[PDB]
CSV table of C-alpha atoms in Angstrom, one decimal:
chain,number,residue,atom,x,y,z
O,16,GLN,CA,21.4,-29.8,-21.0
O,17,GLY,CA,21.7,-26.8,-18.6
O,18,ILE,CA,17.8,-26.5,-18.2
O,19,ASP,CA,15.9,-25.7,-15.1
O,20,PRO,CA,13.5,-28.2,-13.3
O,21,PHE,CA,9.7,-27.4,-13.9
O,22,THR,CA,8.0,-25.2,-11.3
O,23,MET,CA,4.3,-24.2,-10.9
O,24,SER,CA,5.0,-21.9,-7.9
O,25,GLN,CA,7.9,-21.0,-5.7
O,26,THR,CA,8.1,-21.7,-1.9
O,27,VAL,CA,9.9,-19.4,0.6
O,28,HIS,CA,9.5,-19.6,4.4
O,29,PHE,CA,8.2,-17.2,7.1
O,30,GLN,CA,9.9,-18.1,10.4
O,31,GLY,CA,10.2,-21.7,9.0
O,32,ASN,CA,6.6,-22.0,7.8
O,33,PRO,CA,6.1,-22.5,4.0
O,34,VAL,CA,4.9,-19.6,1.9
O,35,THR,CA,3.8,-19.8,-1.8
O,36,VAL,CA,5.3,-17.2,-4.0
O,37,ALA,CA,3.6,-16.9,-7.5
O,38,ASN,CA,5.3,-17.9,-10.8
O,39,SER,CA,9.1,-17.7,-11.1
O,40,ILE,CA,11.8,-15.0,-10.4
O,41,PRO,CA,13.6,-13.9,-13.6
O,42,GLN,CA,16.7,-16.1,-14.2
O,43,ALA,CA,20.2,-14.9,-15.2
O,44,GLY,CA,20.6,-14.7,-19.0
O,45,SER,CA,16.9,-13.9,-19.7
O,46,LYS,CA,15.2,-10.6,-20.8
O,47,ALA,CA,14.0,-8.3,-18.1
O,48,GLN,CA,10.2,-7.7,-18.4
O,49,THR,CA,8.9,-4.2,-18.7
O,50,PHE,CA,7.4,-2.5,-15.6
O,51,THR,CA,5.9,0.8,-14.5
O,52,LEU,CA,6.2,1.7,-10.8
O,53,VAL,CA,5.4,4.8,-8.7
O,54,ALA,CA,8.2,7.2,-7.6
O,55,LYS,CA,8.4,9.7,-4.5
O,56,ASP,CA,6.7,12.5,-6.5
O,57,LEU,CA,3.8,10.1,-7.4
O,58,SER,CA,5.0,9.9,-11.1
O,59,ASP,CA,5.1,6.7,-13.2
O,60,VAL,CA,8.6,5.2,-13.7
O,61,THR,CA,9.5,2.5,-16.4
O,62,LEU,CA,12.4,0.2,-16.8
O,63,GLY,CA,13.3,2.0,-20.0
O,64,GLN,CA,14.0,5.2,-18.0
O,65,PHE,CA,17.3,3.6,-16.8
O,66,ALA,CA,18.8,2.7,-20.3
O,67,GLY,CA,22.5,2.5,-20.5
O,68,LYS,CA,22.7,1.9,-16.6
O,69,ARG,CA,22.9,-1.4,-14.6
O,70,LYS,CA,19.9,-2.0,-12.3
O,71,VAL,CA,19.7,-3.5,-8.7
O,72,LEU,CA,16.2,-4.3,-7.8
O,73,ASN,CA,15.9,-4.7,-3.9
O,74,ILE,CA,12.4,-6.2,-3.5
O,75,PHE,CA,11.0,-6.6,0.1
O,76,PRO,CA,7.6,-6.9,2.0
O,77,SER,CA,7.6,-3.6,3.9
O,78,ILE,CA,10.1,-0.9,4.6
O,79,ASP,CA,8.2,-0.5,8.0
O,80,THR,CA,9.7,-3.9,9.1
O,81,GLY,CA,13.2,-4.5,10.4
O,82,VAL,CA,15.0,-6.8,8.0
O,83,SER,CA,13.7,-4.8,5.0
O,84,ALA,CA,14.8,-1.6,6.7
O,85,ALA,CA,18.4,-3.0,7.1
O,86,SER,CA,18.6,-4.0,3.4
O,87,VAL,CA,17.7,-0.4,2.3
O,88,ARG,CA,20.4,1.0,4.7
O,89,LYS,CA,22.9,-1.5,3.3
O,90,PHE,CA,22.1,-0.9,-0.4
O,91,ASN,CA,22.3,2.8,0.1
O,92,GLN,CA,25.9,2.5,1.3
O,93,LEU,CA,26.9,-0.1,-1.4
O,94,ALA,CA,25.6,2.3,-4.2
O,95,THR,CA,28.6,4.5,-3.5
O,96,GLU,CA,31.1,1.8,-4.4
O,97,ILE,CA,29.4,0.5,-7.7
O,98,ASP,CA,30.0,1.7,-11.3
O,99,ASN,CA,27.1,3.0,-13.6
O,100,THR,CA,24.3,1.4,-11.5
O,101,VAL,CA,20.8,2.4,-10.1
O,102,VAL,CA,19.6,0.9,-6.9
O,103,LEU,CA,15.8,0.5,-6.8
O,104,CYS,CA,14.0,-0.2,-3.5
O,105,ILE,CA,10.7,-1.9,-4.5
O,106,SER,CA,7.8,-2.9,-2.2
O,107,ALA,CA,3.9,-2.6,-1.8
O,108,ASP,CA,4.4,0.3,0.8
O,109,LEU,CA,2.8,3.5,-0.4
O,110,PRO,CA,5.3,6.1,-1.8
O,111,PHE,CA,4.6,8.1,1.5
O,112,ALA,CA,5.8,5.3,3.8
O,113,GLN,CA,9.0,4.8,1.6
O,114,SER,CA,9.9,8.5,1.5
O,115,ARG,CA,9.2,8.8,5.3
O,116,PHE,CA,11.8,6.1,6.1
O,117,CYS,CA,14.4,7.3,3.6
O,118,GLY,CA,13.9,10.9,4.7
O,119,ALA,CA,14.2,10.1,8.4
O,120,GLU,CA,17.3,7.8,7.8
O,121,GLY,CA,19.0,10.3,5.3
O,122,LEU,CA,19.3,7.6,2.6
O,123,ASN,CA,19.6,9.5,-0.6
O,124,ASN,CA,21.4,7.0,-2.9
O,125,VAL,CA,18.6,4.4,-3.5
O,126,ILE,CA,15.5,5.1,-5.6
O,127,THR,CA,12.1,4.0,-4.0
O,128,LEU,CA,9.3,2.6,-6.2
O,129,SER,CA,5.8,1.4,-5.1
O,130,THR,CA,3.8,-1.4,-6.7
O,131,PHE,CA,0.6,0.0,-5.1
O,132,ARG,CA,-0.9,0.9,-8.5
O,133,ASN,CA,1.0,-1.8,-10.4
O,134,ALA,CA,0.2,-5.2,-8.7
O,135,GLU,CA,1.3,-6.8,-12.1
O,136,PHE,CA,5.0,-6.2,-11.4
O,137,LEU,CA,4.7,-8.7,-8.5
O,138,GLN,CA,3.3,-11.3,-10.9
O,139,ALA,CA,5.9,-10.7,-13.8
O,140,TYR,CA,8.9,-10.6,-11.5
O,141,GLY,CA,7.9,-13.7,-9.7
O,142,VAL,CA,7.8,-12.0,-6.2
O,143,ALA,CA,4.0,-12.1,-5.4
O,144,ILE,CA,3.2,-13.8,-2.0
O,145,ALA,CA,0.2,-16.0,-2.8
O,146,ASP,CA,-0.8,-17.2,0.6
O,147,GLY,CA,-0.9,-16.8,4.4
O,148,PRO,CA,-0.9,-13.5,6.4
O,149,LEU,CA,1.6,-11.8,3.9
O,150,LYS,CA,-0.5,-12.4,0.8
O,151,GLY,CA,-0.4,-9.3,-1.5
O,152,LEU,CA,3.1,-8.2,-0.2
O,153,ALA,CA,6.3,-8.8,-2.2
O,154,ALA,CA,8.6,-11.7,-1.2
O,155,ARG,CA,12.2,-10.7,-0.2
O,156,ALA,CA,14.2,-10.8,-3.5
O,157,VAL,CA,17.1,-9.4,-5.5
O,158,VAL,CA,17.2,-8.9,-9.3
O,159,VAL,CA,20.3,-7.5,-11.0
O,160,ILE,CA,19.9,-6.3,-14.6
O,161,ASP,CA,22.7,-5.2,-17.0
O,162,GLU,CA,22.8,-2.1,-19.3
O,163,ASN,CA,21.2,-4.1,-22.1
O,164,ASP,CA,17.9,-5.1,-20.2
O,165,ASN,CA,19.3,-8.7,-19.5
O,166,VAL,CA,19.1,-10.2,-16.1
O,167,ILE,CA,22.6,-11.0,-14.7
O,168,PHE,CA,21.7,-12.1,-11.1
O,169,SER,CA,18.6,-13.3,-9.3
O,170,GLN,CA,17.9,-14.3,-5.7
O,171,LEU,CA,14.6,-15.3,-4.0
O,172,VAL,CA,15.6,-15.3,-0.3
O,173,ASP,CA,14.7,-18.8,1.1
O,174,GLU,CA,13.6,-17.5,4.5
O,175,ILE,CA,11.8,-14.0,4.5
O,176,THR,CA,13.3,-13.0,7.9
O,177,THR,CA,17.0,-13.3,6.4
O,178,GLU,CA,18.8,-10.4,4.6
O,179,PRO,CA,19.7,-10.9,0.9
O,180,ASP,CA,23.2,-12.0,-0.4
O,181,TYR,CA,24.5,-8.4,-1.0
O,182,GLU,CA,28.1,-9.6,-2.0
O,183,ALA,CA,26.7,-12.0,-4.7
O,184,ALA,CA,24.4,-9.3,-6.2
O,185,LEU,CA,27.3,-6.8,-6.3
O,186,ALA,CA,29.8,-9.4,-7.7
O,187,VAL,CA,28.1,-9.6,-11.2
O,188,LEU,CA,28.5,-5.8,-11.6
O,189,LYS,CA,32.4,-6.0,-11.2
O,190,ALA,CA,34.1,-6.4,-14.6
R,6,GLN,CA,-39.8,12.9,-6.2
R,7,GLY,CA,-36.8,13.0,-3.8
R,8,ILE,CA,-34.4,11.3,-6.3
R,9,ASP,CA,-30.7,12.1,-7.0
R,10,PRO,CA,-29.4,13.6,-10.2
R,11,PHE,CA,-27.6,11.0,-12.5
R,12,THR,CA,-23.8,10.7,-12.1
R,13,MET,CA,-21.2,8.7,-14.1
R,14,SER,CA,-18.3,9.7,-11.8
R,15,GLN,CA,-17.7,12.1,-8.9
R,16,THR,CA,-15.4,15.1,-8.8
R,17,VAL,CA,-13.4,16.2,-5.7
R,18,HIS,CA,-10.5,18.7,-5.8
R,19,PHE,CA,-6.8,18.5,-4.9
R,20,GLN,CA,-5.6,22.1,-4.0
R,21,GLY,CA,-8.5,23.4,-6.3
R,22,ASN,CA,-7.6,21.1,-9.3
R,23,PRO,CA,-10.4,18.6,-10.3
R,24,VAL,CA,-9.9,14.9,-9.5
R,25,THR,CA,-12.2,12.0,-10.8
R,26,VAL,CA,-13.5,9.7,-8.1
R,27,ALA,CA,-15.0,6.4,-9.4
R,28,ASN,CA,-18.8,5.5,-9.1
R,29,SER,CA,-20.8,7.0,-6.2
R,30,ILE,CA,-20.4,7.1,-2.3
R,31,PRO,CA,-23.2,5.1,-0.6
R,32,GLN,CA,-26.2,7.4,0.2
R,33,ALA,CA,-28.1,7.6,3.5
R,34,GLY,CA,-31.0,5.2,3.7
R,35,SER,CA,-29.3,2.6,1.5
R,36,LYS,CA,-27.8,-0.9,2.2
R,37,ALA,CA,-24.1,-1.0,3.0
R,38,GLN,CA,-22.2,-3.3,0.7
R,39,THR,CA,-20.1,-6.1,2.1
R,40,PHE,CA,-16.4,-5.7,2.5
R,41,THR,CA,-13.2,-7.5,3.5
R,42,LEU,CA,-10.3,-5.4,4.7
R,43,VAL,CA,-6.9,-6.2,6.5
R,44,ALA,CA,-6.4,-5.5,10.2
R,45,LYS,CA,-3.2,-4.9,12.3
R,46,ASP,CA,-2.5,-8.6,12.7
R,47,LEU,CA,-2.8,-9.1,8.9
R,48,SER,CA,-6.2,-10.9,9.4
R,49,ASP,CA,-9.3,-10.5,7.1
R,50,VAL,CA,-12.1,-8.3,8.6
R,51,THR,CA,-15.6,-8.2,7.3
R,52,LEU,CA,-18.5,-5.7,7.8
R,53,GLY,CA,-20.5,-8.7,9.4
R,54,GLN,CA,-17.9,-8.8,12.3
R,55,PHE,CA,-19.4,-5.6,13.7
R,56,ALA,CA,-23.1,-6.7,13.9
R,57,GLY,CA,-25.3,-4.9,16.5
R,58,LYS,CA,-22.8,-1.9,16.5
R,59,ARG,CA,-22.9,1.4,14.6
R,60,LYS,CA,-19.9,2.0,12.2
R,61,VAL,CA,-17.9,5.2,11.4
R,62,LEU,CA,-15.8,4.7,8.3
R,63,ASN,CA,-13.0,7.3,8.2
R,64,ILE,CA,-11.6,6.9,4.6
R,65,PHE,CA,-8.5,8.9,3.7
R,66,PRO,CA,-5.5,8.9,1.1
R,67,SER,CA,-2.7,8.2,3.5
R,68,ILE,CA,-2.1,8.1,7.3
R,69,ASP,CA,1.5,9.4,6.4
R,70,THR,CA,0.0,12.8,5.3
R,71,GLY,CA,-1.0,15.6,7.6
R,72,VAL,CA,-4.8,16.2,7.1
R,73,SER,CA,-5.5,12.4,7.2
R,74,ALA,CA,-3.2,12.2,10.4
R,75,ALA,CA,-5.4,14.9,12.1
R,76,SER,CA,-8.7,13.0,11.2
R,77,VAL,CA,-7.4,9.8,12.9
R,78,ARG,CA,-6.3,11.8,16.1
R,79,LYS,CA,-9.9,13.5,16.1
R,80,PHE,CA,-11.8,10.3,15.6
R,81,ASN,CA,-9.8,8.5,18.3
R,82,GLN,CA,-11.0,11.2,20.8
R,83,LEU,CA,-14.7,11.3,19.5
R,84,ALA,CA,-14.9,7.5,19.9
R,85,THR,CA,-14.9,8.0,23.8
R,86,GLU,CA,-18.1,10.2,23.6
R,87,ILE,CA,-20.2,7.9,21.2
R,88,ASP,CA,-22.6,5.1,22.1
R,89,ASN,CA,-22.3,1.4,20.7
R,90,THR,CA,-20.1,2.5,17.8
R,91,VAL,CA,-16.9,1.2,16.1
R,92,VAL,CA,-14.6,3.8,14.4
R,93,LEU,CA,-12.8,2.3,11.3
R,94,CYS,CA,-9.8,4.2,9.8
R,95,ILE,CA,-9.6,3.0,6.2
R,96,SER,CA,-6.8,3.7,3.6
R,97,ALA,CA,-4.5,2.1,0.9
R,98,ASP,CA,-1.6,2.4,3.5
R,99,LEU,CA,-0.1,-1.0,4.4
R,100,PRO,CA,-1.2,-2.4,7.9
R,101,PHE,CA,2.4,-1.7,9.0
R,102,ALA,CA,2.3,2.1,8.2
R,103,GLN,CA,-1.2,2.4,9.9
R,104,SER,CA,0.0,0.6,13.1
R,105,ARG,CA,3.2,2.6,13.2
R,106,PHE,CA,1.2,5.9,13.3
R,107,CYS,CA,-1.3,4.7,15.9
R,108,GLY,CA,1.4,3.2,18.0
R,109,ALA,CA,3.6,6.3,18.0
R,110,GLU,CA,0.5,8.5,18.6
R,111,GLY,CA,-1.0,6.3,21.3
R,112,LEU,CA,-4.4,6.1,19.5
R,113,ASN,CA,-6.0,3.0,20.7
R,114,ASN,CA,-9.8,3.7,20.2
R,115,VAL,CA,-9.9,3.5,16.3
R,116,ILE,CA,-9.6,0.3,14.3
R,117,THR,CA,-7.2,0.5,11.3
R,118,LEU,CA,-8.0,-1.4,8.1
R,119,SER,CA,-6.1,-1.7,4.8
R,120,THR,CA,-7.5,-2.0,1.3
R,121,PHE,CA,-4.1,-3.1,0.0
R,122,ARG,CA,-5.3,-6.7,-0.8
R,123,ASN,CA,-8.9,-5.5,-1.4
R,124,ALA,CA,-8.8,-2.8,-4.2
R,125,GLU,CA,-12.6,-3.6,-4.8
R,126,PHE,CA,-13.7,-1.7,-1.5
R,127,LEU,CA,-12.6,1.5,-3.1
R,128,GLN,CA,-14.9,0.8,-6.2
R,129,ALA,CA,-17.9,-0.3,-4.1
R,130,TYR,CA,-17.8,2.5,-1.5
R,131,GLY,CA,-17.3,5.1,-4.3
R,132,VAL,CA,-13.9,6.4,-3.0
R,133,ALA,CA,-11.4,5.2,-5.6
R,134,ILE,CA,-9.4,8.2,-7.1
R,135,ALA,CA,-9.4,7.5,-10.8
R,136,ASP,CA,-6.9,10.1,-12.1
R,137,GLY,CA,-4.0,12.4,-11.6
R,138,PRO,CA,-1.0,11.7,-9.2
R,139,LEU,CA,-3.3,10.3,-6.4
R,140,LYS,CA,-4.8,7.5,-8.6
R,141,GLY,CA,-5.2,4.2,-6.6
R,142,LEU,CA,-5.4,6.0,-3.3
R,143,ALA,CA,-8.8,6.6,-1.5
R,144,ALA,CA,-10.5,10.0,-1.7
R,145,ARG,CA,-11.2,11.7,1.7
R,146,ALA,CA,-14.6,10.4,2.8
R,147,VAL,CA,-16.9,9.5,5.8
R,148,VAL,CA,-19.6,6.8,5.8
R,149,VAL,CA,-21.7,6.2,8.9
R,150,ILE,CA,-23.6,2.9,9.1
R,151,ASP,CA,-26.3,2.0,11.7
R,152,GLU,CA,-26.6,-1.4,13.7
R,153,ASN,CA,-28.8,-2.8,10.9
R,154,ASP,CA,-26.2,-2.4,8.0
R,155,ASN,CA,-28.0,0.7,6.6
R,156,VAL,CA,-26.0,3.8,5.7
R,157,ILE,CA,-27.2,6.8,7.9
R,158,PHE,CA,-24.6,9.5,6.9
R,159,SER,CA,-22.3,10.0,3.9
R,160,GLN,CA,-19.7,12.6,3.0
R,161,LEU,CA,-17.3,12.9,0.0
R,162,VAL,CA,-15.0,15.8,1.2
R,163,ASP,CA,-15.2,18.3,-1.8
R,164,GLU,CA,-11.5,19.4,-1.3
R,165,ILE,CA,-9.0,16.6,-0.4
R,166,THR,CA,-6.9,18.9,1.8
R,167,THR,CA,-9.9,19.9,4.0
R,168,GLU,CA,-10.8,17.7,7.2
R,169,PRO,CA,-14.2,15.9,7.2
R,170,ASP,CA,-17.4,17.3,8.9
R,171,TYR,CA,-16.9,15.4,12.3
R,172,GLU,CA,-20.0,17.0,14.0
R,173,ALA,CA,-22.4,16.0,11.1
R,174,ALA,CA,-21.1,12.4,11.1
R,175,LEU,CA,-21.5,12.1,14.9
R,176,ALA,CA,-25.0,13.8,14.9
R,177,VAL,CA,-26.7,10.9,13.2
R,178,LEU,CA,-25.5,8.5,16.0
R,179,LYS,CA,-27.3,10.7,18.8
R,180,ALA,CA,-30.9,9.4,19.5
């Protein structure tokens, strides 16, 4: 019927060259997997700590790189025009690097979370770059979860140097 | 005879509060363990790539923190006055964060290496912070290796907010 074709791994591109991304990004209409990530104060943050709220996961390789830096600036602004939603900027950057960027840029709407102590999130959310120079970093992706911990939108950006589809991510939140 | 007392873990301090650091830092007169770390160009760097040269390992929690930032600035200057030696600045910061600091500061003598894809180095070199908010980051430490891959100096800084003993590290290199 409306099933998905079998995948063993995902393939994105870095300046046109193929990159293997582990497993599969969560699909719309499926249960969001539990996660623990590290906040600005070095405390542990779970998915369950955002119950009753909608969640935008803006996953990227490094906040210290241009395209990822633009996505964080965009999502910070888009957070003002969305109802009952938390915007989480997720990467393998240490909490200190993430806070330094947000601090210097005055971006206070988004919530920065590090996978530095939680490499498993990259595996479970299907964003772990498996090969090439960017191995161990997160692929560029967007995962939108509803109030009920159900995935409502998912995007694994085909080319890593391209910004994510903001409008498509925000469209599922509008009722 | 001249043996060391049995340890199961090490204890450093963060603003006076005890912090458990895994295993044991390599001791002087012992073989240096192999390692693979990630350079500025995202390439893999081994210990064997510095054969015939003496090695200063300046291990710290984050280049995006003050005390660690000072140690990198100090070691960059001290590298000019030392014979046949490579100075390696090692941390869990991503290569992008390490290069951004070195670039902005104009520090070109030191060699930055990331443990981000190689969590095992922190275990083998006895610098892995096991508990508290800083878990997963490296403890502040100095490991000096000779040309023959033998450890000649070792220091696990007792208090994490204190700078390492530069003079003692550089003293073993002088013949």
